[PDB]
């Protein structure tokens, strides 16, 4: 859980 | 979200869109496993509403999304409509979600976890970007 | 009079379609309800709104 | 007045109950956590959505979009349901349904 395959990028 | 930015498609796999009969997004929610979505108690979700997973663009037609029906709704019995305390409802999907790279679960904390003040966290959604 | 009160979205962050009697138009008009709070000039349908206020 | 087609995200800081109460007073109850008041704001349509913080390198659901400034002011504290205060209820529900 909580580890997106597609990494989120903030900014 | 007012003053936020567009997310990377599929980067918040637990994020679901709660729609009604007309397919109108009225709230969001989070997948905690393949068959349960945690949302807000004030959203007023019913079995007639549909949970949509693996989504990014709502005006899109190509995305491989999952429109899962709701079989059971469980609003926290302690939810106060005046104070809005215990604003949490659990949704059990009739048909379980199929996990992929763009559809997965968020971690749940322990009742004893301390996320201290000042901690930068993230909020996601299809809510108004301008009031 | 509930029918003359302003349409209130409330403090909550939902985007629920509701209806309120618009004294200006003399008819019921749609607005988006947040899910909590607000007032009684809040109906789920234009028909029920008309039945109650019009 | 502008509802987005594409999913939006926003970084925001967690706030102390005391600091939050400085604005919302007694409205802030035990199962609530405040975040925001920093230039961004959850708004209509965001309800039920997640407020995540990465515990041990993994995104953990710390809050659920609930309520706040009726005009979505980016300067007032946003109030989210505190998941640590509701997690056991969650577990108990999964364990019985």
Number of helices of chain B: 0
Radius of gyration of chain B (CA) equals: 15 Å
- What distance separates the N and C termini of chain B? 9 Å
The radius of gyration computed from the alpha-carbon positions of chain D, rounded to a whole number of angstroms, is 14 Å
Count of distinct strands of chain B:
8
Biggest sheet statistics of chain D: 5 strands, antiparallel
Helix percentage of chain B: under 10%
CATH level 1 class label of chain B: Mainly Beta
Query: What is the correct CATH architecture of chain B?
Result: Beta Barrel
Query: Count of DSSP E strands of chain D?
Result: 5
Q: Approximately what portion of the residues of chain B adopt beta-strand conformation?
A: 25-35%
Q: Kindly provide the name of the CATH class of chain D.
A: Mainly Beta
Protein name (chain A): Chymotrypsin A chain A
Modified residues (Sulfotyrosine) (chain C): 48
Site (Reactive bond) (chain C): 13-14
Subcellular location (chain C): Cell membrane; Membrane; Perikaryon; Cell projection, Growth cone
3D structure, described in words:
- The complex is a heterotetramer of chains A (11), B (131), C (54) and D (97).
- Chain A is low in regular secondary structure and 11 residues long.
- Chain C has one domain (1-54): Factor Xa Inhibitor (Irregular), CATH 4.10.410.10.
- Chain C has one helix at 46-53, and strands at 16-22, 27-33.
- Chain D has a five-stranded antiparallel beta sheet.
- Chain D is globular and about 40 Å long.
- Chains in contact: A-B, A-D, B-C, B-D, C-D.
- At the B-D interface, strand 1, strand 3, strand 4, strand 7 and strand 8 of B face strand 1, strand 2, strand 3, strand 4 and strand 5 of D.
- The PDB classes it as complex (serine protease/inhibitor).
- Keywords: inhibitor, protease-substrate interactions, complex (serine protease-inhibitor), COMPLEX (SERINE PROTEASE-INHIBITOR) complex.
- It forms a tetrameric assembly.
Per-chain topology:
The complex is a heterotetramer of chains A (11), B (131), C (54) and D (97).
Chain B (H helix, E strand, L loop, with lengths): L4 E2 L8 E5 L5 E7 L4 E4 L10 E4 L12 E10 L13 E5 L26 E6 L6
Antiparallel strand pairs in B: 2-3, 2-5, 3-4, 4-7, 5-6, 6-7
Chain C lengths: L15 E7 L4 E7 L12 H8 L1
Antiparallel strand pairs in C: 1-2
Chain D lengths: L7 E8 L1 H8 L7 E5 L13 E6 L2 E10 L9 E6 H12 L3
Antiparallel strand pairs in D: 1-2, 2-5, 3-4, 4-5
Protein name (chain A): Chymotrypsin A chain A
Subcellular location (chain C): Cell membrane; Membrane; Perikaryon; Cell projection, Growth cone
Family (chain C): Belongs to the APP family.
């Amino acid at each position: 859980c909580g580890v997106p395959a597609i990494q989120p990028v903030l900014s | 979200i007012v003053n936020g930015e567009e997310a990377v498609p599929g980067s918040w796999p637990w994020q679901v869109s709660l729609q009604d009969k007309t397919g109108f997004h009225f709230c969001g929610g989070s997948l905690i496993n393949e068959n349960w979505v945690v949302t807000a108690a004030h959203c007023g979700v019913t079995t007639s509403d549909v949970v949509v997973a693996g989504e990014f663009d709502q005006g899109s037609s190509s995305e491989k999304i999952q429109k899962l029906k709701i079989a059971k709704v469980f609003k926290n019995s302690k939810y106060n409509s005046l104070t809005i305390n215990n604003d949490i409802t659990l949704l059990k999907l009739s048909t379980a979600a199929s996990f992929s790279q763009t559809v997965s679960a968020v971690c749940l904390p322990s009742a004893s976890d301390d996320f201290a003040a000042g901690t930068t966290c993230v909020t996601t959604g299809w809510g108004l970007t301008r009031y | 009079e509930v029918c003359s009160e302003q349409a209130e979205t409330g403090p909550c962050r939902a985007m629920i379609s509701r209806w309120y009697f618009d004294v200006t138009e003399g008819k019921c008009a749609p607005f988006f309800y947040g899910g909590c709070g607000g007032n009684r000039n809040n109906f789920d349908t234009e028909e029920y709104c008309m039945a109650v206020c019009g | 007045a502008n509802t987005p087609d594409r999913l939006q995200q926003a970084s925001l800081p967690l706030l102390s109950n005391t600091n939050c109460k400085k604005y919302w007073g007694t409205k802030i109850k035990d199962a609530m956590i405040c975040a925001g008041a920093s230039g961004v704001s959850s708004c209509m349509g965001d309800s039920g959505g997640p407020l995540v913080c990465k515990k041990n390198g993994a995104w953990t659901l710390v809050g659920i979009v609930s309520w706040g400034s009726s005009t979505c002011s980016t300067s007032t504290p946003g109030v989210y349901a505190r998941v640590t205060a509701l997690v056991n209820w969650v577990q108990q529900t999964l364990a019985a349904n």
